[PDB]
Amino acid sequence: VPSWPQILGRLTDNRDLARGQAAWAMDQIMTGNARPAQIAAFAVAMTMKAPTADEVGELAGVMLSHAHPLPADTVPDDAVDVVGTGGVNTVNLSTMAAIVVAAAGVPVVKHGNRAASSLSGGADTLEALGVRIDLGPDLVARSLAEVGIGFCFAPRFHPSYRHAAAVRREIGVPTVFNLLGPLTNPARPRAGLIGCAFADLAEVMAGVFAARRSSVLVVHGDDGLDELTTTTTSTIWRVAAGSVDKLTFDPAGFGFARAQLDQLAGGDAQANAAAVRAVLGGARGPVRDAVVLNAAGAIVAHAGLSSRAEWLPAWEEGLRRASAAIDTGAAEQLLARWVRFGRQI
Amino acid sequence: SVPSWPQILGRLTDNRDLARGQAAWAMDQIMTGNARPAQIAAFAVAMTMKAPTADEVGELAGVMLSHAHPLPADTVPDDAVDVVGTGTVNLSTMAAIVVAAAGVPVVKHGNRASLSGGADTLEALGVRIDLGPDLVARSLAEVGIGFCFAPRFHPSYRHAAAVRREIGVPTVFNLLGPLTNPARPRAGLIGCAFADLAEVMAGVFAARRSSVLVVHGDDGLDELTTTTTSTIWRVAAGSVDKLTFDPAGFGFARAQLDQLAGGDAQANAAAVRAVLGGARGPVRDAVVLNAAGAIVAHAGLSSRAEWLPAWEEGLRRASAAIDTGAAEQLLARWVRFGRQILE
Numbered sequence A: 001v002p003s004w005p006q007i008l009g010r011l012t013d014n015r016d017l018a019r020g021q022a023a024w025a026m027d028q029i030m031t032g033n034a035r036p037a038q039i040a041a042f043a044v045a046m047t048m049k050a051p052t053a054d055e056v057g058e059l060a061g062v063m064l065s066h067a068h069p070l071p072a073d074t075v076p077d078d079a080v081d082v083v084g085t086g087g088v089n090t091v092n093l094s095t096m097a098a099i100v101v102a103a104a105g106v107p108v109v110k111h112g113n114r115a116a117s118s119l120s121g122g123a124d125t126l127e128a129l130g131v132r133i134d135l136g137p138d139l140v141a142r143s144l145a146e147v148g149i150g151f152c153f154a155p156r157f158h159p160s161y162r163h164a165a166a167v168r169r170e171i172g173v174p175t176v177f178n179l180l181g182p183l184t185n186p187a188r189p190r191a192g193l194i195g196c197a198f199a200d201l202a203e204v205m206a207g208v209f210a211a212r213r214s215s216v217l218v219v220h221g222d223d224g225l226d227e228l229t230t231t232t233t234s235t236i237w238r239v240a241a242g243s244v245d246k247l248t249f250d251p252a253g254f255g256f257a258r259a260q261l262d263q264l265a266g267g268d269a270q271a272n273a274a275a276v277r278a279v280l281g282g283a284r285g286p287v288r289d290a291v292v293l294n295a296a297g298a299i300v301a302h303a304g305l306s307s308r309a310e311w312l313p314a315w316e317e318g319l320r321r322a323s324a325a326i327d328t329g330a331a332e333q334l335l336a337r338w339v340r341f342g343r344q345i
Numbered sequence B: 001s002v003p004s005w006p007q008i009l010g011r012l013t014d015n016r017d018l019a020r021g022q023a024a025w026a027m028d029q030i031m032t033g034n035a036r037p038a039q040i041a042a043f044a045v046a047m048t049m050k051a052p053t054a055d056e057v058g059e060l061a062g063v064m065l066s067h068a069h070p071l072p073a074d075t076v077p078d079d080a081v082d083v084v085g086t087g088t089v090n091l092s093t094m095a096a097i098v099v100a101a102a103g104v105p106v107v108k109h110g111n112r113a114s115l116s117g118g119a120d121t122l123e124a125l126g127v128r129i130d131l132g133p134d135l136v137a138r139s140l141a142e143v144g145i146g147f148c149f150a151p152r153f154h155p156s157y158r159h160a161a162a163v164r165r166e167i168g169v170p171t172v173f174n175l176l177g178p179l180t181n182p183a184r185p186r187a188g189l190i191g192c193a194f195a196d197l198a199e200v201m202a203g204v205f206a207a208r209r210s211s212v213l214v215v216h217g218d219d220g221l222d223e224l225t226t227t228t229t230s231t232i233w234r235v236a237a238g239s240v241d242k243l244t245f246d247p248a249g250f251g252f253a254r255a256q257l258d259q260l261a262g263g264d265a266q267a268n269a270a271a272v273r274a275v276l277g278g279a280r281g282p283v284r285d286a287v288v289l290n291a292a293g294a295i296v297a298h299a300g301l302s303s304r305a306e307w308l309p310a311w312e313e314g315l316r317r318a319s320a321a322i323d324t325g326a327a328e329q330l331l332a333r334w335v336r337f338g339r340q341i342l343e
């Protein structure tokens, strides 16, 4: 017999939930039946108990059951996502990597929205580049077919999440809800590079992806970055065929020099947009290096769907393809093509 | 740094104690109607799971007090006591009557609760529970006991009270009742269901230089009973001894938890009338125990007496108060006072 006092009581007593309790709670939230106080109490208690992968899979699965889908046969089977869950943040890096990956010929389907103020959301940077971010499912699918990239604006695909999003804005603090973005991409891409700023939650997310039919790299810079970093090593949870392979990754093995931490963080939408134009135009430096690193990681994830190429040669190839997509102008050109698509309605 | 919800909640979710003043800021937001329900709830839960400190709880209680209606000046005897728990047959209500009848002024504080609460049981007995400060003061003066109805004394708490009801689960706010009695008694017997929080409560009383016994049944009750041993934090002179308490040491037989079972207001009123009329059994025993503890706390405002003799005198005084008829007579005087208000 599920109820808020029961579920909240179990969480505050530091107990993992019974199977189905997280699903019940999410469905109450998603149907407009949870009070703001109940939504907040749940988010916080779940965060402080430390969610399990089973629990997170329930939350994400319920949320997806309420989302608008893309139309039948419209997402390529091998589409990928490239995104972090936030720190500071790296929307600068994930935005540029996504364009690079798509320019390398891998279909990309991203998901997000506008942030409340000045630390750019994913959507805001694209909007500052002239990309049209709020498109219906049919137009997102056209974008994928004609441009090789699409963007699913969270408020349009997840209308029933509005009660949770309001509570999240009111309380400010990061919660378990911050983890759901990468896991509730309404295009349901089966591969991805997914960054997490916290190693304990990264393992949890990897667990959720492992229970899906997915080929993903969940990544955590050992400096706290929610992307593969160039300032030090990163932890990677490699997910494929329902299993996880956790490893320490060092980009110095591919000849990347060490950068400093104040060189990579994203800023506001305009600052991100300027940085995007510089990198896609060929400006060398630590930002480009991190973009190429994370783009290659997405490409490696994508390869995991079919290739069965081994880890090291897959990396060598993802790096060569990412670098080439920039240096040959393919990424600059793809961004311009994406902007053109939007202007043509 | 300017306090904010993101900052405060983030510190709590990182399992960190707050900076001085952060808890105070949160309560003031709450008390002024400036905190949204979601922020109140997030704070209540986060503080609970982190485990509040005495300093933090003192901040919450002090701000809450600052918004409360006071009793009029010089109307509360310097040596008043409270008898109360933080959350089953209203033992604390019977014990309050016995303590008052033993000559110790008592001021209780609470609210209406299917399980009848203290306040609901007093109304079933004919006591007028919702009186303003001037009349609570007069009751204290003329009867030796008073009751502060929480919604009337803490009107600004209504935003928090609604959130509490919405989420259901116990939180740090459950500690506040004993620490925000608007009559500000300096002594008390205070029951708490949870050992860690009982110790936190003791610390706040210690910081106030109160003379209190904070009691924890080793079987999860927020009262003393004859069911089990209990843990007691003896607070006096800003200092704290933690002690084990076993009622078998004073001759009490061990009772079963279900012989103390409460019911509706009418049933609980009958139980009060039976104890005050001198009926023997485990209810009487539990009442005598809690009243004795309150009396011991009261004694602690002047002297620091030997523990065991304090308890013997406390127990004798509580027993006498029943068996002389003084407790039954005090309830009658209390009812009478309330009935005189109309004219």
Ligand SMILES: Nc1ccccc1C(=O)O
Pocket: A113, A154, A155, A156, A158, A159, A160, A161, A162, A163, A165, A166
């Ligand atoms: N504000 C949001 C943020 C993310 C996902 C959905 C929403 C929504 O309002 O439906």
Ligand SMILES: Nc1ccccc1C(=O)O
Pocket: B111, B150, B151, B152, B154, B155, B156, B157, B158, B159, B161, B162
């Ligand atoms: N339940 C309460 C306790 C104290 C103050 C106000 C309220 C209220 O309900 O408005």
